[PDB]
Design a protein around this motif. Structure first.
Motif, PDB file in Angstrom:
ATOM      1  N   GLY A 197       0.874  -1.211   0.098  1.00  0.00           N
ATOM      2  CA  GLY A 197      -0.038   0.258  -0.030  1.00  0.00           C
ATOM      3  C   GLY A 197       0.986   1.256  -0.150  1.00  0.00           C
ATOM      4  O   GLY A 197       0.206   2.445   0.332  1.00  0.00           O
ATOM      5  N   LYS A 198       2.199   1.201  -0.492  1.00  0.00           N
ATOM      6  CA  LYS A 198       2.868   2.485  -0.380  1.00  0.00           C
ATOM      7  C   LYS A 198       2.291   3.273  -1.164  1.00  0.00           C
ATOM      8  O   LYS A 198       2.761   4.535  -1.150  1.00  0.00           O
ATOM      9  CB  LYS A 198       4.678   2.256  -0.642  1.00  0.00           C
ATOM     10  CG  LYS A 198       5.002   1.394  -1.266  1.00  0.00           C
ATOM     11  CD  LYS A 198       6.288   0.866  -1.905  1.00  0.00           C
ATOM     12  CE  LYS A 198       5.573  -0.411  -1.633  1.00  0.00           C
ATOM     13  NZ  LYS A 198       6.602  -1.799  -1.377  1.00  0.00           N
ATOM     14  N   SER A 199       2.210   2.605  -2.725  1.00  0.00           N
ATOM     15  CA  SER A 199       1.780   4.131  -3.743  1.00  0.00           C
ATOM     16  C   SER A 199       0.589   4.202  -3.256  1.00  0.00           C
ATOM     17  O   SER A 199      -0.214   5.588  -3.954  1.00  0.00           O
ATOM     18  CB  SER A 199       1.892   2.940  -5.276  1.00  0.00           C
ATOM     19  OG  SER A 199       1.210   1.808  -4.991  1.00  0.00           O
ATOM     20  N   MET A 200      -0.691   3.150  -3.009  1.00  0.00           N
ATOM     21  CA  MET A 200      -1.671   3.616  -2.683  1.00  0.00           C
ATOM     22  C   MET A 200      -1.642   4.859  -1.490  1.00  0.00           C
ATOM     23  O   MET A 200      -2.931   5.318  -1.591  1.00  0.00           O
ATOM     24  CB  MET A 200      -3.119   2.888  -2.348  1.00  0.00           C
ATOM     25  CG  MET A 200      -3.759   3.155  -2.335  1.00  0.00           C
ATOM     26  SD  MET A 200      -4.555   3.318  -4.790  1.00  0.00           S
ATOM     27  CE  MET A 200      -4.841   1.559  -4.782  1.00  0.00           C
ATOM     28  N   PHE A 224       9.728   8.324  -7.943  1.00  0.00           N
ATOM     29  CA  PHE A 224      10.859   7.276  -8.699  1.00  0.00           C
ATOM     30  C   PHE A 224      10.751   5.784  -8.258  1.00  0.00           C
ATOM     31  O   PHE A 224      10.692   5.631  -7.516  1.00  0.00           O
ATOM     32  CB  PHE A 224      12.236   7.482  -8.821  1.00  0.00           C
ATOM     33  CG  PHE A 224      12.662   8.567  -9.048  1.00  0.00           C
ATOM     34  CD1 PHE A 224      13.064   8.399 -10.322  1.00  0.00           C
ATOM     35  CD2 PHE A 224      13.127   9.570  -8.483  1.00  0.00           C
ATOM     36  CE1 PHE A 224      13.547   9.832 -10.717  1.00  0.00           C
ATOM     37  CE2 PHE A 224      13.356  10.579  -8.522  1.00  0.00           C
ATOM     38  CZ  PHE A 224      13.872  10.868 -10.267  1.00  0.00           C
ATOM     39  N   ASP A 225       9.485   5.123  -9.164  1.00  0.00           N
ATOM     40  CA  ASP A 225       8.151   3.880  -8.663  1.00  0.00           C
ATOM     41  C   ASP A 225       9.662   2.942  -9.508  1.00  0.00           C
ATOM     42  O   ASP A 225       9.297   2.289 -10.909  1.00  0.00           O
ATOM     43  CB  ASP A 225       7.233   4.597  -9.288  1.00  0.00           C
ATOM     44  CG  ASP A 225       6.119   2.286  -8.591  1.00  0.00           C
ATOM     45  OD1 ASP A 225       4.695   2.796  -9.394  1.00  0.00           O
ATOM     46  OD2 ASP A 225       6.345   1.770  -8.537  1.00  0.00           O
ATOM     47  N   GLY A 226      10.768   2.802  -9.282  1.00  0.00           N
ATOM     48  CA  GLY A 226      10.803   1.226  -9.389  1.00  0.00           C
ATOM     49  C   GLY A 226      12.549   1.290  -8.718  1.00  0.00           C
ATOM     50  O   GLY A 226      12.510   1.953  -7.646  1.00  0.00           O
ATOM     51  N   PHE A 263      10.778   7.529  -2.821  1.00  0.00           N
ATOM     52  CA  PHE A 263      11.238   6.579  -3.810  1.00  0.00           C
ATOM     53  C   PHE A 263       9.860   4.988  -3.402  1.00  0.00           C
ATOM     54  O   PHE A 263       9.704   5.722  -2.136  1.00  0.00           O
ATOM     55  CB  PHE A 263      12.722   6.489  -3.403  1.00  0.00           C
ATOM     56  CG  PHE A 263      13.527   7.175  -3.504  1.00  0.00           C
ATOM     57  CD1 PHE A 263      13.547   8.406  -3.246  1.00  0.00           C
ATOM     58  CD2 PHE A 263      14.140   6.738  -5.725  1.00  0.00           C
ATOM     59  CE1 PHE A 263      14.799   9.333  -4.129  1.00  0.00           C
ATOM     60  CE2 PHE A 263      15.072   8.189  -5.425  1.00  0.00           C
ATOM     61  CZ  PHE A 263      15.107   8.880  -4.476  1.00  0.00           C
ATOM     62  N   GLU A 264       9.243   4.217  -4.684  1.00  0.00           N
ATOM     63  CA  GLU A 264       8.957   3.086  -4.164  1.00  0.00           C
ATOM     64  C   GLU A 264      10.096   1.918  -4.657  1.00  0.00           C
ATOM     65  O   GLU A 264      10.589   2.237  -5.068  1.00  0.00           O
ATOM     66  CB  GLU A 264       7.555   3.004  -4.832  1.00  0.00           C
ATOM     67  CG  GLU A 264       6.098   4.404  -4.704  1.00  0.00           C
ATOM     68  CD  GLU A 264       5.326   3.917  -5.036  1.00  0.00           C
ATOM     69  OE1 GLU A 264       5.214   2.652  -4.907  1.00  0.00           O
ATOM     70  OE2 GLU A 264       4.658   4.517  -5.394  1.00  0.00           O
ATOM     71  N   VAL A 265      10.309   1.667  -3.233  1.00  0.00           N
ATOM     72  CA  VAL A 265      11.162   0.027  -4.169  1.00  0.00           C
ATOM     73  C   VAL A 265      10.838  -0.490  -3.160  1.00  0.00           C
ATOM     74  O   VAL A 265      10.268  -0.682  -1.619  1.00  0.00           O
ATOM     75  CB  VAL A 265      12.824   0.809  -3.786  1.00  0.00           C
ATOM     76  CG1 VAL A 265      12.486   1.994  -4.067  1.00  0.00           C
ATOM     77  CG2 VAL A 265      12.809   1.016  -1.671  1.00  0.00           C
ATOM     78  N   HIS A 271       9.032  -9.113  -7.994  1.00  0.00           N
ATOM     79  CA  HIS A 271       7.564  -9.689  -7.243  1.00  0.00           C
ATOM     80  C   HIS A 271       6.977  -8.444  -7.755  1.00  0.00           C
ATOM     81  O   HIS A 271       5.530  -8.417  -7.584  1.00  0.00           O
ATOM     82  CB  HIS A 271       7.659  -9.020  -6.005  1.00  0.00           C
ATOM     83  CG  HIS A 271       8.732 -10.604  -5.291  1.00  0.00           C
ATOM     84  ND1 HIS A 271       9.483 -10.834  -4.709  1.00  0.00           N
ATOM     85  CD2 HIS A 271       7.796 -12.074  -5.718  1.00  0.00           C
ATOM     86  CE1 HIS A 271       9.976 -12.640  -4.794  1.00  0.00           C
ATOM     87  NE2 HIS A 271       8.867 -12.929  -5.099  1.00  0.00           N
ATOM     88  N   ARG A 272       7.248  -6.562  -8.057  1.00  0.00           N
ATOM     89  CA  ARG A 272       5.750  -6.012  -8.180  1.00  0.00           C
ATOM     90  C   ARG A 272       5.373  -5.738  -9.528  1.00  0.00           C
ATOM     91  O   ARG A 272       4.565  -5.998  -9.458  1.00  0.00           O
ATOM     92  CB  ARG A 272       6.612  -4.554  -8.584  1.00  0.00           C
ATOM     93  CG  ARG A 272       7.712  -3.685  -6.943  1.00  0.00           C
ATOM     94  CD  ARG A 272       7.647  -2.124  -7.229  1.00  0.00           C
ATOM     95  NE  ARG A 272       6.714  -1.705  -7.110  1.00  0.00           N
ATOM     96  CZ  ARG A 272       6.227  -0.989  -6.243  1.00  0.00           C
ATOM     97  NH1 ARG A 272       7.103  -1.720  -4.834  1.00  0.00           N
ATOM     98  NH2 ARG A 272       5.402  -0.649  -5.593  1.00  0.00           N
ATOM     99  N   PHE A 273       6.269  -6.811 -10.402  1.00  0.00           N
ATOM    100  CA  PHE A 273       5.875  -7.552 -11.780  1.00  0.00           C
ATOM    101  C   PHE A 273       5.255  -8.855 -11.586  1.00  0.00           C
ATOM    102  O   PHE A 273       3.743  -8.943 -12.000  1.00  0.00           O
ATOM    103  CB  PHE A 273       6.188  -7.673 -12.661  1.00  0.00           C
ATOM    104  CG  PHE A 273       5.973  -8.106 -13.683  1.00  0.00           C
ATOM    105  CD1 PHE A 273       5.423  -7.987 -14.796  1.00  0.00           C
ATOM    106  CD2 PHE A 273       6.748  -9.803 -13.868  1.00  0.00           C
ATOM    107  CE1 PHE A 273       5.448  -8.086 -16.019  1.00  0.00           C
ATOM    108  CE2 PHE A 273       6.285 -10.070 -15.166  1.00  0.00           C
ATOM    109  CZ  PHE A 273       5.323  -9.402 -16.067  1.00  0.00           C
TER     110      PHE A 273
HETATM  111 MG    MG Z   1       3.662   0.941  -5.896  1.00  0.00          MG
END
Ligand code: MG
Ligand code: ANP
Ligand code: ATP
Ligand code: ADP
Length: 1083
Positions: free
Chosen positions: A369-372, A443-445, A483-485, A865-867
């Motif tokens: 839920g970090k992006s949300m 930076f979402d990666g 940053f999202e990692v 795992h994000r994919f």
């Molecule tokens: Mg995310």
């Protein structure tokens, strides 16, 4: 001014030092000052050596600043500008200034030796001062630097800070006085610094806080982002002083608004200092804390600070806005210790961190839920503060670093802005009043040391992006770099130190929250309206009068009502997921992958009911039929979402468990798996085997009909394919080689009318460039008022990219596949960034569908795992006995159409081709030898073999057919074997299978042991004797001697056979010293 200590007597060089950090004069600091000044009086160098973060370099800096001398600290970690170091030494010698090398051990041996020689020359020149006989009225001291006699001033000195584990180079061991800074005195630093902030009690607070950090260091799990050193402790104490002063001013203003007189000392006297320090510690540490370590940290805090607790600050306005936005976007909200309390706490921590730092990171695992959380926070501060919030999401590894930051043209100098530089320049220029707005660049990666080098300056206190063009962009205060990692495995500590952090542990998003999100999305999002009505969702805050937006909404609302009992916190889905996690799967099982797959299948279920209502307009679906259908479909989707990535035995295991725990009826046939059954449009079950037709194939295309022979495994998977293509989810299929994923996918995709299949084969060298080239080939960019949209040239056709081997692209040095991250950003954000023009482009009718082999295979790699969260993965096992029997029974029936006399033996033959094959698959395995691999590709190669022995021949007896069958069996299975006893077993088992499936056929005529087939002796491909073939091959070999290679080649028993095998393989279609010889003979 003269500063003296013991023998040493220095003069204060009046150099302006600014507001430099002062160092608490601890006992170790006093000892270091004593020894360093003694060494400088003796003209020797200083070597304060010790563990990392023990005050060495800054103690040298403090001593240099106490005497006013310019100190110049040289780092020694992959940033050492050697070409300037001779110049810097010359400058130090001439002007008079100190030089400190932080961790001089870290230098490479060549670098170490060269700098050691330079410092040795300098220190010898300095030691030449110390002798008394040398009168300094006429003493031009000099040293050999850069091939020049550079004059040395006496005020200059050099220090070399070392890290033991070790010693100094032998050049400088005689010249440098060493001092062990093994252990700084934490208690006195904490005491003096807390007393500097005005704390009435400092001895007790210092004596408590100092052991607490050490206790956290030992007890808590080792993580890279943790830091409990002296720097972190001092930052915590500064924040504690700030909180104290804020509390003074809070009480002061509260009294001032009412009628009171103010005095700062009276207010400061009656406060708890322990509560302030604890609040600072928690506010600075808990956001970084993993969920496993937070209760340990609180336990340690209670132990070190008994009877003191941290009550979190109440943000009522932000919490209300968060509740409103969460209800708007179908997200569960809580007030702490409820369903979703931890996530609310984490978004509040994110708000605090964004307020404090200008650069921050979210470092949860995938699906936490970090992006949300970030999106909810931006849209909540939208309503709270009346400032428009804008997000620039960039997948940094997908784009190259040069296009990310822009590259200077090496010739014909012109600047091309990168994507990030373009965004920053756009914000600074403020063409649309961007300065008035609030902008977050996320930076979402995966983060790497390569693409964050230019961002180090921005994230640090400089807040200045320096480009090779020479332009220095100042970050405005509105911009926030986030940053999202998934993790920080490959991130430099330099990047982590500059940024704030919020760790989103996977136990921040419970299963109950995701189920609530799914059901809320079902109840309000019509499932057929798509994207045209997506804007209208925001037009109405409650959408009153639009309950029946379509019949789709009503039917899916009824479906959600039926599904609620099974989605509870202890319902069927939860227990099924917990059990499925125990099963091993070819791909790493993530929670959100399973849940997304299940939600897509249920979406297709309600779509099917809508189809039924459309096809029965007079009397649409009743609620009882709907109840039965959805109850059975939930079990079916649970199985195909959880155990869809596992072997048949584990699918049966999960089916048995579901039978154990469920209330929905399951079928009443004993020896059939549940996965074999489908839920019909009526509620009752029905076998899949009824929906698989028996077809007849033409003889022209007997082994390569690109239409798959419908078997069970093909009538199942294609259905699933459609269920996951209606939602546009990126399907992925895995399984052992030869299973049939490629043909199954191609046939299922081409069966659809709208789909345009584009066949991409991935490999180790494949990159984003391949997908971009495919887009320029089949698709095109068009400008719209909404924005740039990529679309297929063909109108009303859903273009789909077949990525044949998704696993195979090579990872970078930091464990990231570029193309996989590119596809991830497309399937998640629905678009990408045109790098040439540096602008966002949205996909309209683009889809992805992948095939793979299991990641255990050598050339393959595991997917991110994000994919893997987005893609549903199916495991195509080998067809098995019945599927093989059907598939190759059709092929053999087509094959025997050439000769009409052996049609009756078509089915007896096929079973044999199955049985022996299965026996081989059970007798020989990859463990014995790496090449003992069997698949349906063998069986086709069997079929094709017999076909090219039967095509020219006008007629055959049954014994001839059996002989050709045995010959192809030997040529496909016996040749690969390594051991003689295995070959003998194959010899006996071919005879056993043939005589079992062909009784009353005499073995002696049908299968004599020396089975040889050749086409050289006669025009047709018919059996021949050993001696005639020997004579022909010997004559041709004798011709070959004097033709291409003039060496004798002897013919023995075990080389004629290889010649025949090679010629046979040359004669088949797709058929893949002796090789040259047979190629020459066959032309
Ligand atoms: Mg995310
Ligand atoms: N149901 C089926 N009907 C007909 N042929 C089948 C069937 N299942 C598997 N095969 C055969 O299986 C072989 C391999 O199929 P194919 O999909 O082309 O390779 P693949 O699945 O892509 N293996 P790989 O791409 O290396 O992971 C072919 O020779 C097919 O004829
Ligand atoms: N507060 C919430 N309440 C309910 N469901 C939520 C909440 N936050 C997230 N979800 C659900 O969890 C999903 C994952 O959230 P999010 O996309 O932020 O994950 P993530 O950890 O950033 O994942 P990834 O590794 O894919 O980037 C959301 O799509 C939504 O389905
Ligand atoms: N005697 C001291 N007084 C005050 N602060 C200190 C003292 N010793 C160390 N520190 C702090 O500890 C940290 C140590 O880092 P630094 O000296 O730069 O590298 P190292 O200690 O590894 O040589 C610094 O942030 C410094 O402020």
């Amino acid at each position: 001014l003269s500063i003296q200590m013991a023998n040493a007597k220095f003069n204060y060089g009046f150099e302006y030092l600014g507001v430099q950090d002062k160092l608490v004069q601890t006992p170790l600091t006093d000892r270091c000052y004593l020894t360093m000044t003694q060494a400088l009086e003796a003209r020797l160098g200083g070597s304060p050596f010790g563990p990392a973060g023990t005050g060495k370099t800054e103690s040298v800096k403090a001593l240099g600043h106490q005497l006013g001398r310019f100190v110049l600290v040289f780092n020694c970690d992959e940033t050492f500008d050697f070409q300037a170091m001779g110049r810097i030494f010359v400058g130090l010698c001439q002007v008079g200034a100190w030089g400190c090398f932080d961790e001089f051990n870290r230098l490479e041996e060549r670098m170490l030796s060269a700098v050691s020689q330079q410092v040795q020359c300098i220190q010898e020149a300095l030691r030449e001062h110390s002798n008394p006989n040398y009168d300094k009225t006429s003493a031009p001291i000099t040293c050999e630097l850069l091939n020049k006699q550079v004059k040395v001033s006496p005020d200059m000195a050099i220090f070399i800070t070392m890290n033991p584990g070790s010693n100094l180079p032998d050049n400088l061991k005689k010249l440098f006085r060493s001092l062990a800074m093994t252990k700084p005195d934490r208690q006195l630093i904490a005491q003096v610094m807390l007393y500097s902030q005005g704390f009435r009690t400092a001895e007790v607070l210092a004596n408590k806080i100092v052991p607490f950090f050490k206790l956290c260091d030992e007890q808590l799990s080792s993580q890279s982002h943790y830091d409990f050193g002296l720097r972190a402790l001092k930052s915590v104490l500064v924040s504690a002083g700030n909180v104290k002063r804020e509390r003074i001013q809070k009480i002061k203003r509260e009294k001032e608004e009412r009628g009171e007189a103010v005095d700062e000392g009276e207010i400061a006297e009656n406060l708890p200092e322990q509560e302030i320090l604890i609040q600072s510690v928690c506010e600075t540490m808990v956001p970084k804390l993993v969920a496993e370590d937070i209760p340990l940290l609180f336990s340690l805090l209670s132990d070190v600070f008994p009877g003191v607790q941290y009550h979190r600050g109440e943000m009522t306005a932000l919490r209300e806005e968060l509740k409103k936005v969460c209800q708007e976007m179908y997200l569960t909200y809580g007030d702490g210790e409820e369903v979703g309390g931890m996530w609310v706490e984490k978004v509040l921590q994110l708000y605090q961190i964004t307020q404090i730092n200008h650069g921050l990171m979210m470092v949860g695992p995938s699906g936490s839920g970090k992006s949300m959380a970030w999106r909810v926070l931006l849209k909540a501060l939208e309503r709270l503060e009346g400032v428009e919030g804008v997000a620039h999401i960039i997948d940094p590894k997908a784009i190259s670093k040069d296009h990310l930051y822009g590259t200077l043209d090496p010739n014909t100098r012109e600047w091309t802005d990168g994507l990030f530089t373009h965004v920053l320049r756009k914000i600074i220029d403020s063409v649309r009043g961007e300065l008035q707005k609030r902008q977050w660049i996320v930076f979402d990666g995966d983060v790497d040391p390569e693409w964050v080098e230019n961002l180090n300056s921005v994230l640090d206190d400089n807040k200045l992006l320096t480009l090779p063009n020479g332009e220095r962009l100042s970050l405005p205060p509105n911009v926030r770099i986030m940053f999202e990692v998934q993790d920080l495995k490959y991130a430099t500590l330099a990047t982590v130190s500059r940024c704030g952090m919020v760790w989103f542990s996977e136990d921040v998003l419970s299963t109950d929250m995701i189920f609530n999100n799914f059901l809320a999305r079902l109840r309000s999002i019509p499932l057929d309206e798509g994207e045209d009505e997506a804007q209208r969702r925001r037009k109405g805050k409650e959408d009153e009068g639009e309950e029946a937006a379509s019949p789709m909404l009503q039917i899916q609302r009824d479906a959600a009502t039926i599904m609620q009992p099974y989605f509870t916190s202890n319902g069927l889905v939860t227990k099924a997921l917990e059990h499925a996690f125990q099963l091993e799967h070819i791909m790493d099982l993530t929670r959100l992958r399973c849940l997304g797959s299940l939600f897509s299948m249920l979406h297709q279920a309600c779509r099917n009911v809508a189809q039924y209502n459309a096809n029965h307009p007079d009397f649409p679906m009743q609620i009882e039929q709907l109840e039965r259908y959805i109850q059975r479909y939930l079990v079916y989707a649970i199985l195909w979402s959880l155990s869809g990535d596992s072997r048949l035995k584990m699918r049966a295991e999960l089916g048995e468990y579901i039978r154990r725990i469920t209330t929905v009826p399951l079928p009443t046939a004993p020896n059939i798996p549940i996965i074999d059954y489908e839920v019909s449009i009526s509620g009752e079950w029905s076998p899949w085997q009824a929906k698989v037709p028996q077809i007849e194939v033409e003889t022209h295309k007997v082994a390569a009909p690109d239409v798959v022979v419908p078997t069970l495994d093909t009538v199942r998977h294609e259905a699933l394919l459609y269920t996951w293509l209606a939602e546009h989810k990126p399907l992925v299929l895995c399984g052992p080689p030869g299973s049939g994923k490629t043909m199954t996918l191609f046939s299922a995709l081409r069966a659809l009318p709208d789909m345009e299949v584009v066949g991409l084969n991935f490999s180790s060298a494949t990159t984003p460039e391949l997908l971009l080239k495919t887009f320029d080939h089949y698709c095109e960019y068009r400008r719209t008022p909404n924005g740039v949209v990529l679309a297929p040239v063909q109108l009303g056709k859903w273009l789909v990219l077949f990525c044949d081997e998704i696993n195979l692209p090579d990872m970078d040095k930091y464990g990231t596949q570029r193309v996989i991250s590119f596809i991830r950003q497309m399937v998640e954000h629905g678009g990408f960034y045109r790098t040439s023009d540096q602008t966002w482009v949205k996909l309209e009718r683009i889809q992805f569908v992948g095939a793979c082999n299991p990641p255990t295979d050598p050339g393959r790699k595991p997917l991110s795992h994000r994919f893997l969260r987005h893609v549903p993965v199916v495991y195509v096992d080998y067809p098995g006995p019945a599927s093989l029997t059907q598939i190759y029974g059709t092929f053999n029936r087509a094959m025997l159409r050439l000769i009409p006399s052996l049609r009756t033996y078509a089915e007896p033959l096929t079973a044999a081709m199955v049985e022996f094959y299965t026996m081989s698959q059970e007798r020989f395995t990859q463990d014995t030898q790496p090449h003992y691999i069997y698949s349906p590709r063998e069986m086709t190669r069997w079929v094709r073999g017999i076909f090219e022995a039967l095509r020219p021949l006008e007629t055959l007896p049954v014994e001839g057919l059996i002989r050709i069958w045995a010959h192809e069996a030997l040529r496909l299975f016996q040749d690969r074997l390594v051991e003689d006893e295995e070959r003998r077993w194959t010899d006996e088992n071919i005879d056993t299978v043939a005589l079992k499936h062909f009784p009353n056929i005499d073995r002696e005529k049908a299968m004599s042991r020396p089975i040889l087939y050749s086409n050289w002796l006669s025009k047709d491909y018919i059996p021949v004797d050993q001696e005639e073939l020997r004579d022909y091959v010997k004559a041709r070999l004798k011709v070959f001697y004097e033709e291409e290679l003039d060496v004798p080649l002897v013919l023995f028993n075990e080389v004629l056979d290889h010649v025949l095998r090679i010629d046979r393989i040359f004669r088949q279609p797709q058929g893949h010293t002796l090789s040259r010889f047979v190629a020459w003979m066959n032309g």
